Amino acid sequence: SLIRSATKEDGQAIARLVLVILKDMELPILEEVSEEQMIDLLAEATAYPTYRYGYQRILVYEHAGEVAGIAVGYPAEDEKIIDEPLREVFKKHGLAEDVRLFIEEETLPNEWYLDTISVDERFRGMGIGSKLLDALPEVAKASGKQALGLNVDFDNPGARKLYASKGFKDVTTMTISGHLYNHMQKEVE
């Protein structure tokens, strides 16, 4: 029902969705910090313009006036600065600043890079991811980028078919933390 860019008040909702990703990565920080505290830390980092999951980097899909899914991405040149805000928030809260997060080696030069499309578990099976993805060319374009890019795991040929059908084309191959990926791009107006 509504697609809009995230606001500062979408912090907790974005943080809940991001928690799912962390931990699916099995980040060791989740053994040391409770879920509730991790959500608070993430939400606070959300308020930084440059954060990986900063609201300014995020498109929201609103279903029944509630955050149902988010699409998150950034210019490729921003990849080395995106995790700094979360390290700053950790330092503020007395935690070690050098928590293991993402390996920052996944983009190609000159794309708007799609980091994640995440759909709330309560709203699966409703087309939300695929609609968020339809909205993304205009985001790349407004960013001055002529390519929108992404990585799909080799063992996700279903997702890869989905992106193919939306105009994405295989461009390279990457290995990140043992997993192999197809890097795909779609040209933008």
8 A C-beta contact, residue 128 and residue 68:
yes
Please give the DSSP secondary-structure letter assigned to residue 150. E
Q: Using CA atoms, how far apart are residues 142 and 116, in angstroms rounded to an integer?
A: 19
Q: Is 113 helix (H, G, I), strand (E, B) or coil?
A: strand
Q: What is the CATH number of the domain that holds 151?
A: 3.40.630.30
Q: How many helices and strands, by DSSP H and E, does the chain display?
A: 6, 7
Task: Report the C-alpha gap between 82 and 110 in whole angstroms.
Answer: 17
Please, which experimental method was used? X-ray
Domain tally, the chain: 1
Domain housing 90: 1-189
Under the phi-then-psi rule, with left for phi > 0, alpha for psi from -120 to 50, and beta for the rest, what region is 188?
A: beta
Among 97, 49, 99, 41, residue whose Cα is nearest residue 74: 49
Report resolution in angstroms. 2.4
Helix (H, G, I), strand (E, B) or coil at 65: coil
| Contact by Cβ (8 Å): 76, 100 | no
